[PDB]
Write a protein that holds these residues in place. Structure first.
Motif, PDB file in Angstrom:
ATOM      1  N   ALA L 111     -25.614  -2.644  18.604  1.00  0.00           N
ATOM      2  CA  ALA L 111     -26.451  -2.204  19.711  1.00  0.00           C
ATOM      3  C   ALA L 111     -27.061  -0.844  19.423  1.00  0.00           C
ATOM      4  O   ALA L 111     -28.227  -0.590  19.746  1.00  0.00           O
ATOM      5  CB  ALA L 111     -25.638  -2.158  20.997  1.00  0.00           C
ATOM      6  N   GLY L 112     -26.286   0.043  18.801  1.00  0.00           N
ATOM      7  CA  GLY L 112     -26.781   1.380  18.526  1.00  0.00           C
ATOM      8  C   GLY L 112     -27.942   1.389  17.556  1.00  0.00           C
ATOM      9  O   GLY L 112     -28.966   2.028  17.814  1.00  0.00           O
ATOM     10  N   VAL L 113     -27.810   0.678  16.438  1.00  0.00           N
ATOM     11  CA  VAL L 113     -28.864   0.673  15.434  1.00  0.00           C
ATOM     12  C   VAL L 113     -30.130   0.045  15.996  1.00  0.00           C
ATOM     13  O   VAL L 113     -31.236   0.557  15.792  1.00  0.00           O
ATOM     14  CB  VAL L 113     -28.415  -0.107  14.183  1.00  0.00           C
ATOM     15  N   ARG L 114     -29.988  -1.065  16.719  1.00  0.00           N
ATOM     16  CA  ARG L 114     -31.153  -1.718  17.306  1.00  0.00           C
ATOM     17  C   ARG L 114     -31.840  -0.804  18.309  1.00  0.00           C
ATOM     18  O   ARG L 114     -33.073  -0.727  18.352  1.00  0.00           O
ATOM     19  CB  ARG L 114     -30.755  -3.015  17.995  1.00  0.00           C
ATOM     20  N   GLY L 115     -31.056  -0.102  19.124  1.00  0.00           N
ATOM     21  CA  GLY L 115     -31.643   0.843  20.052  1.00  0.00           C
ATOM     22  C   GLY L 115     -32.264   2.025  19.338  1.00  0.00           C
ATOM     23  O   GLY L 115     -33.366   2.461  19.675  1.00  0.00           O
ATOM     24  N   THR L 116     -31.569   2.549  18.326  1.00  0.00           N
ATOM     25  CA  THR L 116     -32.058   3.740  17.645  1.00  0.00           C
ATOM     26  C   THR L 116     -33.445   3.503  17.061  1.00  0.00           C
ATOM     27  O   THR L 116     -34.276   4.416  17.027  1.00  0.00           O
ATOM     28  CB  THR L 116     -31.094   4.177  16.528  1.00  0.00           C
ATOM     29  N   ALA L 117     -33.714   2.280  16.608  1.00  0.00           N
ATOM     30  CA  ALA L 117     -35.041   1.969  16.090  1.00  0.00           C
ATOM     31  C   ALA L 117     -36.106   2.293  17.122  1.00  0.00           C
ATOM     32  O   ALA L 117     -37.223   2.688  16.772  1.00  0.00           O
ATOM     33  CB  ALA L 117     -35.117   0.497  15.694  1.00  0.00           C
ATOM     34  N   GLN L 118     -35.775   2.129  18.400  1.00  0.00           N
ATOM     35  CA  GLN L 118     -36.745   2.393  19.453  1.00  0.00           C
ATOM     36  C   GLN L 118     -36.655   3.831  19.941  1.00  0.00           C
ATOM     37  O   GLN L 118     -37.660   4.414  20.358  1.00  0.00           O
ATOM     38  CB  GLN L 118     -36.536   1.429  20.624  1.00  0.00           C
ATOM     39  N   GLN L 119     -35.458   4.423  19.901  1.00  0.00           N
ATOM     40  CA  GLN L 119     -35.282   5.777  20.376  1.00  0.00           C
ATOM     41  C   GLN L 119     -34.443   6.572  19.385  1.00  0.00           C
ATOM     42  O   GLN L 119     -33.208   6.533  19.472  1.00  0.00           O
ATOM     43  CB  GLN L 119     -34.624   5.781  21.760  1.00  0.00           C
ATOM     44  N   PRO L 120     -35.061   7.321  18.473  1.00  0.00           N
ATOM     45  CA  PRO L 120     -34.274   8.016  17.447  1.00  0.00           C
ATOM     46  C   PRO L 120     -33.234   8.974  18.005  1.00  0.00           C
ATOM     47  O   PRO L 120     -32.260   9.290  17.316  1.00  0.00           O
ATOM     48  CB  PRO L 120     -35.351   8.774  16.662  1.00  0.00           C
ATOM     49  N   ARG L 121     -33.421   9.448  19.236  1.00  0.00           N
ATOM     50  CA  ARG L 121     -32.444  10.361  19.819  1.00  0.00           C
ATOM     51  C   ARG L 121     -31.103   9.688  20.050  1.00  0.00           C
ATOM     52  O   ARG L 121     -30.096  10.379  20.230  1.00  0.00           O
ATOM     53  CB  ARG L 121     -32.956  10.913  21.140  1.00  0.00           C
ATOM     54  N   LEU L 122     -31.074   8.357  20.055  1.00  0.00           N
ATOM     55  CA  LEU L 122     -29.829   7.636  20.272  1.00  0.00           C
ATOM     56  C   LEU L 122     -28.870   7.812  19.108  1.00  0.00           C
ATOM     57  O   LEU L 122     -27.654   7.668  19.277  1.00  0.00           O
ATOM     58  CB  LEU L 122     -30.111   6.144  20.485  1.00  0.00           C
ATOM     59  N   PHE L 123     -29.396   8.135  17.928  1.00  0.00           N
ATOM     60  CA  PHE L 123     -28.570   8.171  16.728  1.00  0.00           C
ATOM     61  C   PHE L 123     -27.334   9.034  16.934  1.00  0.00           C
ATOM     62  O   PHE L 123     -26.217   8.630  16.594  1.00  0.00           O
ATOM     63  CB  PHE L 123     -29.375   8.702  15.540  1.00  0.00           C
ATOM     64  N   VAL L 124     -27.513  10.224  17.504  1.00  0.00           N
ATOM     65  CA  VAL L 124     -26.375  11.112  17.708  1.00  0.00           C
ATOM     66  C   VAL L 124     -25.396  10.493  18.693  1.00  0.00           C
ATOM     67  O   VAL L 124     -24.178  10.519  18.482  1.00  0.00           O
ATOM     68  CB  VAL L 124     -26.843  12.481  18.237  1.00  0.00           C
ATOM     69  N   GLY L 125     -25.912   9.929  19.782  1.00  0.00           N
ATOM     70  CA  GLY L 125     -25.041   9.262  20.732  1.00  0.00           C
ATOM     71  C   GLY L 125     -24.285   8.107  20.107  1.00  0.00           C
ATOM     72  O   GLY L 125     -23.096   7.914  20.371  1.00  0.00           O
ATOM     73  N   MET L 126     -24.963   7.325  19.263  1.00  0.00           N
ATOM     74  CA  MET L 126     -24.296   6.226  18.579  1.00  0.00           C
ATOM     75  C   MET L 126     -23.110   6.710  17.760  1.00  0.00           C
ATOM     76  O   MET L 126     -22.029   6.115  17.821  1.00  0.00           O
ATOM     77  CB  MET L 126     -25.290   5.484  17.684  1.00  0.00           C
ATOM     78  N   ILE L 127     -23.289   7.782  16.991  1.00  0.00           N
ATOM     79  CA  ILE L 127     -22.206   8.271  16.145  1.00  0.00           C
ATOM     80  C   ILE L 127     -21.030   8.720  16.998  1.00  0.00           C
ATOM     81  O   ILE L 127     -19.871   8.418  16.692  1.00  0.00           O
ATOM     82  CB  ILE L 127     -22.676   9.435  15.257  1.00  0.00           C
ATOM     83  N   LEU L 128     -21.308   9.457  18.074  1.00  0.00           N
ATOM     84  CA  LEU L 128     -20.241   9.963  18.926  1.00  0.00           C
ATOM     85  C   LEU L 128     -19.397   8.825  19.473  1.00  0.00           C
ATOM     86  O   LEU L 128     -18.163   8.902  19.486  1.00  0.00           O
ATOM     87  CB  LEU L 128     -20.825  10.778  20.085  1.00  0.00           C
ATOM     88  N   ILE L 129     -20.049   7.757  19.924  1.00  0.00           N
ATOM     89  CA  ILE L 129     -19.323   6.622  20.470  1.00  0.00           C
ATOM     90  C   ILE L 129     -18.485   5.956  19.392  1.00  0.00           C
ATOM     91  O   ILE L 129     -17.318   5.612  19.616  1.00  0.00           O
ATOM     92  CB  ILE L 129     -20.286   5.591  21.085  1.00  0.00           C
ATOM     93  N   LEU L 130     -19.085   5.762  18.214  1.00  0.00           N
ATOM     94  CA  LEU L 130     -18.352   5.140  17.080  1.00  0.00           C
ATOM     95  C   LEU L 130     -17.155   6.026  16.720  1.00  0.00           C
ATOM     96  O   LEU L 130     -16.127   5.485  16.253  1.00  0.00           O
ATOM     97  CB  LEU L 130     -19.306   4.984  15.894  1.00  0.00           C
ATOM     98  N   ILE L 131     -17.286   7.335  16.947  1.00  0.00           N
ATOM     99  CA  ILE L 131     -16.186   8.281  16.603  1.00  0.00           C
ATOM    100  C   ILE L 131     -14.966   7.916  17.446  1.00  0.00           C
ATOM    101  O   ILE L 131     -13.851   7.923  16.898  1.00  0.00           O
ATOM    102  CB  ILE L 131     -16.620   9.737  16.843  1.00  0.00           C
ATOM    103  N   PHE L 132     -15.181   7.591  18.724  1.00  0.00           N
ATOM    104  CA  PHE L 132     -14.046   7.263  19.623  1.00  0.00           C
ATOM    105  C   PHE L 132     -13.336   6.022  19.085  1.00  0.00           C
ATOM    106  O   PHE L 132     -12.100   5.997  19.116  1.00  0.00           O
ATOM    107  CB  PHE L 132     -14.538   6.970  21.041  1.00  0.00           C
TER     108      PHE L 132
END
Lengths: 203, 98, 78, 84, 49, 40, 350, 150, 43, 150, 150, 150, 150, 150, 150, 51
Positions: L111-132
């Protein structure tokens, strides 16, 4: 898919438990607690025999009956526009009744062999009675299941025959050959069941 | 607290039925309703306080269980033994109230 | 005067009253149920959070208790 | 730093609550040298009741230290709200 | 007015939280004139107020 | 022991007839009525 | 798989026999030739009476016109469909509903536009295609209010889920009516295709090839026809279904294409389609691409009748009979207008 | 001497052979019959060619018959048990192998008939495939015979 | 002694009852509200 | 000296080897034949090349036949059990591995046959992949041969 | 003093190592081949450099083959049981771990090849991702190698 | 003095640790690869960065590798039983916990990668969530380590 | 001298004969009534004729009643087991046979009633096919009765 | 002399009779009520005639109550077991037969009631068909009464 | 003299009486609640009449509550087992019968309330149907009381 | 069981209330009965666990 999920869950748990119990009985080196001979010999041959008899007849009816509805619906449906169908395609249902009869005759020939033992301690008692018991079970099961699947075969094929004849009356005769092969499948089950009980005795 | 508060809520209904001059709602309503609740649930409340002041540790063994007597009360269940009574004559009172 | 409907209505009142008295009395078990829960949630929040803020080490205890309490305070409210 | 007056205001409330709780707690430990009865005693406990009094004194000191940090926090957060 | 807060206090009978709960109410009342004579688009704060 | 000749034989026959019941009920449950009637 | 050929005949056994019995009544090549040898509309009626068609133009106006025979032909197959739809159970009825959805979609496009240009529903319903039906109210007596029609559809009309692409009403007013209907239909194909794959037996294998064709066929024609109009390439791509053979890679090329030649180059990667573009000589006096597509679609729908235990026979039935109607009307029209050299432009249905 | 119950396994062998082979033949036949009827409506001239898959299915039935008869004739009361296990294995070997073959025969015959209906040049191709399926069934028989006489 | 009796009884009694709960829970878990009337608008 | 029923495990090996390998080849054949029948309509000239996946599948079946026979020939009454378990392991190893290989043959043939008709240059790629599936089957045979003689 | 049931556990280890690894490689091969066939329609020039997912799948099969041989060579009669459980663990560890890798290889290969067809830049990425899956399989081998000699 | 089979539970621990951890990483890898392939067509740039979810998945597998080795090294024949049970617990704890983490990594990465393609700002949020999710995997390791040495 | 539990098997025969037959007849009735309800709207004149499928379904139930009672009147306390299993067999024989017949009557009757309304010439064909269904149930009774005294 | 735990079977009978009969009546009631609500919304004048299905369902429930009580009043502590099996048979016979009758009532009720509004001449046919379903429920009672006193 | 474990049966009864009847009432209430919401938005004037199915549902739960208490107050350590079996049967009888009643109440409530929204004359018929479902629940209570005091 | 009851009616109730605020009273009543089911569970547990 509520029922399919139920069937699967039971299937998996059923065998998963058997795997754990089997491997555990081995691992913990139990004194042959899982004794197959115990199961087979304690179970009265009367259970095995009468089960095979009921199955032989009852499963054959299930097949016959299954096939009957397969071709019944197809024949009736097609007949809405082709009333000629009922003249010839009824033989498919004749084949289904014949598939049931196979089992009925076999079931009776087997049941005619049923006798009491007046037996108690299985040890060295009724050795031959156990053979006859298991053989009757097998022969009954053999013919039952064979007729069961035979009946389904001839039903499915009879459906195609009715759908073909609805559109072209020249096709029935040629297609009829397939149902004959179907009927043969059931007869083969009969031949083996006869052999299996050809040399049995009870009592 | 619950039972006492409930009884208050019922008591208020009397004033309303008086205000609207509905004798039937008090002669066939309030009175049997408040008695019904009192006889079952107010009785329970009394017994709770009774136990606290009636029994000491000196009788902790075979000390009556209020919940069991309450259920046996409703069912008219009076075993010969196995449960001590809270007070003499309780059997007659329990039967009467139900 | 609809005698039939009146009899039914009054019967319903009695049925609900009597059964409600039984259920309503039990309902007030909410007072106990929540009072118990609150005490238990408070006890565990104390025991599993602020207890940790105390220590046999002096300076470490003082500084840690600051941060641990802040978390305790936060959870206490939340 | 401003940090937002909404968050500085929260700090003031946390700081005030903390100072009140930490001072009162430290006193309780010092007086009943107790209900909490969790000063982290030794397992090798000898017949010396004075050892328990000394443990509570240490706990009390730690409580006042934590209060001091909340006093500093309240001071900083206070000026933030006034400047914001 | 009395019955409900009383039943609450029975369910919420915790002295320390009672202080917090009381102080919150006092704060709101002491700022009543400033909170009421203002805009409060957040219905959650308005509700408790 | 875990099982007796009586108990076991009972379970063996019970399952066969239980499967028959399951088969019958299965087809009964998977039985629908019409959404609408053809015409007036 | 063993999925069909067992429980299938329990509920759907009758319908399978009936619908194939109905198929038997479709005009054969021998029958079409007999119909061509008329040159008179009344003689056409007489020759039709030799088949399952006929006796339905009786009691109509003495002079026979093309418009009359056209409407009657539709009505005949509508009744046959509704009959089979009514005598059916959910496992099959849901399949048939999808077929009706295709017609409902066209009808709601008709209800809008008319609502957008104050026309009363009562005036619009008589010209809606059968099978739309709309027995539900609220879609009726909308008071020529777009919001009322869009609320009635969202709530009562089975097409509500499909409109999720086109929503908020704003879409209805700002989007071109044709983009709206093409978008809605794409959503239909996507759901219907997935439905067929959920029925993962003979139906999926017999039916999906037809839907996959429709997806690719529309993608081809849409690309070509869109060349001469004003439409963003991205918005055009939004109309391509993803249930087909062009989806993996190929639609990207059609979306970029600005010429017929580029579209053919896309077909070049698919021999099943390349043959259609090469056969569509497109000369000034020859068959075109749409004509070859119709011939192919019929091949596919006829092959559907080679499986005796599925739902794809009912879909194919409707489409083949609909083409049968097109063929008959074509003949009636060619007779009326006396263009005898153009009579052999019907699509044979075997 | 010869232990009791020892015939139990051999009886299951003879039954397994016939029943699973019947399953294969029944499925393969039903699938071919459906395809045959489906074709024959469209064009009858290929009907004779489309029959072979049904014979293929019947052979599966025979494979099972050969072993089931061999075992059933061999069964007695005083079986040394070892022999029963060979019979059990032989029964399953031919039955389940023929079952797999019958499934294959069904799938390829049905697809082959529809294919040939569209393309007469396919005839040789589908026959070669069906030969492989018959070979798959024979392998079952071979192992079963080796075990049954061991 | 008589283990096989208690065992057999308890095993199948609790198994059947446990399954009855599981099936009943399944049927309730997936109760169909109709997904209509107001659901189309809220979705 | 040896326990009873010791042949039970071994004979299941001989049966398992043949049945699973036949099931694998049967699946691979069925899937390949379906693709061939559907493909051959448009490209009849490929009928004699698209058969290859089917031959591959037959090899899986032989793999199984070879081990099943070897187990049967080495299966005796006075077996030391040790050898019986080895035979069961060898039977399962080749059978189940062949089953996995048959699946791969099936999927790759089905897609490959159609892909080749749409793309003549795929023919070599199809063969290479199917070579990998045959290798997957061979690995099973190798282990079974090691175990059955251990 | 050796328990006989000990060889069963052991040989099941060797079997598991091969069977589950073949299942994984077969799955990865089946999915990779399907994607390749579809890809080849548009980009036939990529066919040869798209085989890699299949080679990797094969490496998973080898992981299993190697352990299965190492155990099979280690199997004896007088096994101390301890060794048997180590063989069983080693067998399952490499087999089931390879099985998991097979799914990663398969799914990533399919998606990667289909994507690469349109975005040639994905190729290095496809390989990096698939390298991780092969590494996951190797982990299974590492543990199996530690256990089989313990 | 302890049962000769007491070592069974431990080796099942070492195997379970590796198998479940690899399964988690394999799922997470497959899910990420699918999303990455789709994203890569939309835009090249992010291909490189989008690998991270896959690396995290790999770490889950390592978590399991560490415990599986620790158990294998400590497992002996004369095991204390108590220690064996602890090893089974440690194995399951890290394996199943990593398995749960693998799903979190997979779903979130996709979900993160697919979203990030549309909103690059998601990348940081994606990593933080994966960190948990990686932290959740670590938690399993912590308990397994405590049980392994306990 | 009577094996305890001997009476248990017998009484289950009486139960099965009635319960399974009732299930069959109940299904047969349900299908027939549904078809009648749908048909009768347009052609009410056929309501009386259309009832026949329902009567036959009922007959199936009677066969079960006959056996269930015959067994019930044949139960005693000192049952010699031999007799008990004979009664169980008879119960199951008629039960399943009647159950299967009820399905045939229901499914055929439903189609028959709908078809007859469309084409009255099918009425006789409907009856003929349905008689066969009943004859199957009869078969079940005949054998079940014969077995009861053997 | 009487076997222990002998009462269990008879107790299950008494409960089974009531529960299965309630299940049957409950299903029949629910299905009829749905048809009634859907039907009588258009034609309320039929609301007092469409209730009958529901009444018949209630009779199924009474059958169960009569037997369940008859069984309960027949139980004691020192039961000879024989009697208990008879009680269990009687309980199940009526319970499961009523259950089957419940489905017949339900399906025919729904279909009949809605059809009746479309065609009022159907009402009598609906009742006659539902009569057979009540008879099916009664057959169960007849057997249960025969067994419960045997 | 009292068999230990005997209390298990009666104890499960007291729980079952509440648990199963609670699920029934839970279904009834939940199913009715959805129907009520649909009606009320269309017209809230009936909001105080459509609640009745819910009140009825509650009464069912009470039926179970009554038995559960009666059983619990009838438990002892020195239980004679006979009474324990009766308690289990009594608990199940009311619990499972109330469960059936719960479904009956929910289904007809939803259909009746939704219909009533359009046709106010439906109310009376709805109540009568609801009465049958409450009666279905009571029958269970009656039997349970008879058994528990037997 | 009570959790199921509360959840299902809550979803329908909350959605309905926004459509028609008059639903509030009906929603509350329905929620109560669902909660009572949980209460009944407690009642039995209290009586049984103390017996």
């Amino acid at each position: 898919t509520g029922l399919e999920l139920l069937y699967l869950g039971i299937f998996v748990a059923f065998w998963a438990c058997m795997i754990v119990v089997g491997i555990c009985y081995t691992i913990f080196d139990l004194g042959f607690r899982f004794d197959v001979a115990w199961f087979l010999t304690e179970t009265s041959p009367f259970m095995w025999s009468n089960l095979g008899i009921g199955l032989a007849i009852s499963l054959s009816v299930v097949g016959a009956a299954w096939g009957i509805y397969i071709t019944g619906s197809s024949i009736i449906g097609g007949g809405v526009k082709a009333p000629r169908i009922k003249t010839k395609n009824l033989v498919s249902i004749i084949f289904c009744e014949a598939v049931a009869i196979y089992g009925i005759i076999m079931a009776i020939v087997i049941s005619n062999m049923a006798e009491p033992f007046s037996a108690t301690d299985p040890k060295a008692i009724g050795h031959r009675n156990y053979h006859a018991g298991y053989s009757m079970f097998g022969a009954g099961l053999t013919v039952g299941l064979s007729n069961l699947f035979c009946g389904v075969c001839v039903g499915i094929v009879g459906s195609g025959a009715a759908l073909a004849d609805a559109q072209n009356p020249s096709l029935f005769v040629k297609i009829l050959i397939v149902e004959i092969f179907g009927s043969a499948i059931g007869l083969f089950g009969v031949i083996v069941a006869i052999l299996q009980t050809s040399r049995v005795k009870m009592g | 607290l619950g039972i006492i508060h409930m009884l208050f809520g019922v008591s208020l209904s009397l004033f309303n039925h008086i205000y609207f001059k509905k004798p039937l709602n008090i002669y066939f309503g309030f009175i049997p309703e408040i008695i019904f609740m009192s006889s079952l649930f107010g009785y329970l409340v009394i017994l709770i306080f009774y136990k606290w002041t009636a029994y000491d540790a000196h009788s902790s063994r075979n000390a009556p269980s209020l919940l069991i007597h309450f259920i046996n009360m409703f069912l008219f269940s009076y075993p010969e033994s196995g449960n001590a009574m809270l007070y003499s004559g309780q059997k007659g009172i329990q039967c009467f109230l139900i | 005067f609809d005698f039939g409907d009146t009899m039914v209505h009054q019967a319903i009142h009695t049925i609900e009253y009597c059964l409600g008295c039984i259920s309503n009395t039990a309902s007030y078990l909410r007072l106990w149920a929540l009072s118990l829960a609150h005490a238990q949630l408070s006890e565990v929040l104390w025991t599993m959070v602020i207890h940790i803020g105390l220590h046999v080490r002096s300076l470490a205890g003082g500084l840690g208790l600051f941060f641990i309490f802040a978390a305790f305070a936060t959870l206490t409210v939340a | 730093l401003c940090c937002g007056p909404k968050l500085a205001a929260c700090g003031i409330v946390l700081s005030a609550w903390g100072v009140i709780m930490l001072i009162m707690l430290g006193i309780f430990f010092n007086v009943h040298s107790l209900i909490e009865d969790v000063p982290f005693t030794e397992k090798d406990f000898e017949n010396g009741p004075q050892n328990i009094y000394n443990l509570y004194e240490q706990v009390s000191y730690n409580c006042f230290i934590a209060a001091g940090l909340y006093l500093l926090l309240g001071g900083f957060s206070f000026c933030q709200v006034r400047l914001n | 007015v009395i019955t409900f807060p009383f039943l609450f206090a029975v369910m919420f009978g915790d002295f320390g939280h009672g202080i917090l709960m009381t102080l919150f109410a006092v704060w709101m009342v002491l700022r009543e004139s400033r909170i009421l004579s203002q805009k409060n688009e957040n219905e959650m704060f308005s509700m408790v107020f | 022991g875990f099982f007796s000749p009586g108990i076991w034989m009972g379970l063996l026959t019970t399952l066969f007839m239980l499967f028959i019941f399951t088969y019958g009920l299965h087809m009964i449950l998977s039985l629908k009525t019409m959404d609408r009637f053809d015409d007036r | 798989s063993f999925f069909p050929e067992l429980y299938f005949n329990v509920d759907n056994g009758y319908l399978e026999g009936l619908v194939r019995g109905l198929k038997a009544g479709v005009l054969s090549q021998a029958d079409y030739l007999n119909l061509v040898q008329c040159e008179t509309l009344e003689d056409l009626k007489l020759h039709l009476q030799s088949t399952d068609y006929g006796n339905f133009l009786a009691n109509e106006a003495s002079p026979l016109t093309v418009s009359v025979i056209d409407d009657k032909l539709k009505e005949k197959m509508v009744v046959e469909f509704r009959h089979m739809r009514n005598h059916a159970y959910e496992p099959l009825a849901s399949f048939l509903d999808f077929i009706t959805y295709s017609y409902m979609i066209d009808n709601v496009i008709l209800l809008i536009t008319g609502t957008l240009h104050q026309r009363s529903i009562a005036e619009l319903v008589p010209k809606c295609h059968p099978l739309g039906s709309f027995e539900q109210m609220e879609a009726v007596n909308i008071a020529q209010t777009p919001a009322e029609l869009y609320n009635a559809i969202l709530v009562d009309t089975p097409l509500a889920a499909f409109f999720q692409d086109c929503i908020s009403e704003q879409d209805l007013d700002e989007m071109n009516i044709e983009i709206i209907r093409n978008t809605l239909y794409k959503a239909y194909l996507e759901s219907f295709y997935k439905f067929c794959t959920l029925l993962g037996g003979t139906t999926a294998d017999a039916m999906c090839p037809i839907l996959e064709f429709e997806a690719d066929r529309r993608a081809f024609i849409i690309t070509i026809n869109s060349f001469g109009t004003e439409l963003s390439k991205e918005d055009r791509a939004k109309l391509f279904p993803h249930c087909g053979r062009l989806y993996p890679e190929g639609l990207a090329q059609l979306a970029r294409a600005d010429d017929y030649e580029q579209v053919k180059n896309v077909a070049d990667y698919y021999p099943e389609y390349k043959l259609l573009f090469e056969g569509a000589g497109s000369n000034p006096g020859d068959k075109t691409l749409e004509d070859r597509f119709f011939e192919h679609e019929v091949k596919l729908n006829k092959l559907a009748f080679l499986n005796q235990f599925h739902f794809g026979v009912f879909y194919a039935f409707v489409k083949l009979k609909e083409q049968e109607c097109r063929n008959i009307v074509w003949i009636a029209e060619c007779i009326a207008q006396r263009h005898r050299a153009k009579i052999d432009n019907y699509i044979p249905i075997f | 001497n010869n232990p009791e119950y020892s015939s139990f396994f051999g009886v299951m062998g003879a039954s397994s052979a016939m029943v699973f082979s019947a399953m294969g033949a029944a499925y393969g036949t039903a699938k071919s019959g459906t395809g045959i009827a489906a074709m024959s409506v469209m064009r009858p001239e290929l009907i004779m060619k489309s029959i072979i898959p049904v014979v293929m299915a019947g052979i599966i039935a025979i494979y099972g018959l050969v072993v089931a008869v061999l075992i059933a004739n061999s069964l007695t009361d005083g079986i040394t048990l070892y022999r029963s296990f060979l019979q059990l294995g032989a029964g399953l070997s031919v039955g389940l192998s023929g079952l797999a073959a019958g499934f294959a025969i069904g799938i390829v015959g049905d697809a082959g008939v529809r294919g040939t209906a569209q393309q007469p040049r396919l005839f040789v191709g589908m026959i070669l495939i069906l030969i492989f399926a018959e070979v798959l069934g024979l392998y079952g028989l071979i192992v079963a015979l080796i075990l049954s006489t061991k | 002694l008589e283990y096989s009796v208690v065992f057999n009884l308890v095993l199948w009694i609790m198994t059947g009852l446990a399954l009855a709960v599981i099936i009943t829970s399944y049927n309730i878990w997936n109760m169909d509200p109709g997904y209509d009337s107001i659901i189309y608008r809220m979705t």
